[PDB]
Design a protein around this ligand. Structure first.
Ligand SMILES: Cc1c(C)n(Cc2ccc(-c3ccccc3C(=O)O)cc2)c2ccc(C(=O)N[C@@H](C)c3ccc([N+](=O)[O-])cc3)cc12
Ligand SMILES: Cc1c(C)n(Cc2ccc(-c3ccccc3C(=O)O)cc2)c2ccc(C(=O)N[C@@H](C)c3ccc([N+](=O)[O-])cc3)cc12
Ligand SMILES: *c1ccc([N+](=O)[O-])cc1C(=O)Nc1ccncc1
Ligand SMILES: *c1ccc([N+](=O)[O-])cc1C(=O)Nc1ccncc1
Lengths: 253, 248
């Protein structure tokens, strides 16, 4: 019934808000009028001065601490998902391990636009161009991200929505490795039931948004494909580049 | 008013039974009289077959999948406490962060008698001799909780008593880091009233029990303070996706 779903639809908005500190609603406020903009190496060097923190490497090692903290938050988010904790532990570690990345770039879209990305909690902004002109093996780690973000941000989801979506992701069940898929799918069938109603109410003028949302996992899967191969080359150029251990468990290529 | 506190007493009970799968008055059957028994080593190995799930580790670590389950049941429980939802979201988390250990051991005492403890929904019973019979630091990890519990069930508390008492623990305004303490206490001084009443109609003979209860969070907060140091010794004994699920 409507009531049982609307209620789960709030339970999740609540956990999302407690577990994620830069929300899409907060990000958009910073981006629609303040951050320090970074566009060349001269501003970036003024940028160590201005905002809390070779050129492309200690950028990259910084983009990956931010992902380590984001895996930390995703986990905390996922526990609050009704039913998740009540699942074979090998699955909880597998739903987590594959469903992180798909979520990072969903939520990373909340910090992007046509022109750039907000770094370092909001304090800074990195132009799309500084990113698209970096060292040969680093200068496109974030390019396809931007093109998804603009495709994605188009749907104009907000946080009440993203929070059920972020949940439909985690609870996949089409994941490689899972033992007991039937309870995973049985949970997600409820999220999907929840999400469908959320969209029809928060965005009632957005025809086939549910359908058009669900389709973005196709775009989303592809993005992570491109990422693991891209990371594989940097572990061959920079065999001196150390990756974080938490991030390494998520990489069974 | 006197009739409202009887309303709230019901409200929280119905919430309790819903939010909490295994209730004391339920497990009470399993203890007195059926479940497996784990008296020594060969029974324990025989235990992974029937109740599907180093050896003394595979034990404690598993007491923690159940904690993490239990924090959710408490979380979904707290939200039925009138005006709990209405608090500053920051305070909600803080009340729950600190409240959960104190509320876990209270329920760990409805799964204990003198002789051991129920496990995995009560399809098991681990002999306290066996839990005593563990390598250090493990054999007396669960032994000070055994001492608290018989002291605690001594009051002969039922589930509706625990339902108000559980709420009262969460709404404790002395938690470090609260922002707007007044409405928290407003609810606790309400539940406290409600708990006083319930304790009389349900134990009219039990004498000054309300008082002997509030004297136990003296013991609850002292187990917790001491339990959590045992967790930091374990951080000097003994995949990273797991440790993240199971942060203290
Ligand atoms: C390129 C880059 C730098 C240099 N920093 C700051 C930083 C970070 C770490 C370190 C560092 C790392 C290891 C060891 C030492 C240091 C060190 O220099 O101290 C240095 C600089 C970033 C912070 C966030 C993002 C980002 O992608 N934004 C999203 C993900 C986001 C933005 C904001 C939020 N948010 O929660 O608000 C979530 C996601 C990118 C960068
Ligand atoms: C030592 C131990 C083991 C091995 N299991 C089973 C188990 C269960 C899960 C996992 C596990 C964990 C993480 C990831 C995967 C797995 C996995 O199994 O693979 C491993 C072993 C236990 C279950 C309960 C308790 C206990 O003290 N009782 C409390 C908790 C209780 C008593 C009564 C009730 N109740 O109300 O019914 C609840 C809890 C102790 C143990
Ligand atoms: C950028 C580059 C590399 C990695 N990584 O090693 O996994 C991650 C990122 C990144 O952008 N992470 C992130 C995106 C959005 N929000 C937070 C973190
Ligand atoms: C067992 C082992 C460690 C901890 N802890 O880190 O606080 C807790 C427990 C435990 O007894 N958990 C439990 C809670 C509620 N119901 C049943 C079991």
């Amino acid at each position: 019934e409507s009531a049982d779903l609307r209620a789960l639809a709030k339970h999740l908005y609540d956990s999302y808000i407690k577990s994620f500190p830069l929300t899409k609603a907060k990000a958009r406020a910073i981006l629609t009028g303040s951050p320090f903009v970074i566009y060349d190496m001269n501003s970036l060097m003024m940028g160590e001065d201005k905002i809390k923190f070779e050129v492309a490497i200690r950028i990259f090692q910084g983009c990956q601490f931010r992902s380590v903290e984001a895996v930390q938050e995703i986990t905390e988010y996922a526990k609050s998902i009704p039913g998740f904790v009540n699942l074979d532990l090998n699955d909880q570690v597998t739903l987590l391990k594959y469903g992180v990345h798909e979520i990072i770039y969903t939520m990373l879209a909340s910090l992007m636009n046509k022109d750039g990305v907000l770094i370092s909690e909001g304090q800074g902004f990195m132009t799309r161009e500084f990113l698209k002109s970096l060292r040969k093996p680093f200068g496109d780690f974030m390019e396809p991200k931007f093109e998804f973000a603009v495709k994605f941000n188009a749907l104009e989801l907000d946080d009440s929505d993203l929070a059920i979506f972020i949940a439909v992701i985690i609870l996949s069940g089409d994941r490689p490795g899972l033992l007991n898929v039937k309870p995973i799918e049985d949970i997600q069938d409820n999220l999907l039931q929840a999400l469908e109603l959320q969209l029809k109410l928060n965005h009632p003028e957005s025809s086939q948004l549910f359908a058009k949302l669900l389709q973005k996992m196709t775009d989303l899967r592809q993005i992570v494909t491109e990422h693991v191969q891209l990371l594989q080359v940097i572990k061959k150029t920079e065999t001196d580049m150390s990756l974080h251990p938490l991030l390494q468990e998520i990489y069974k290529d």
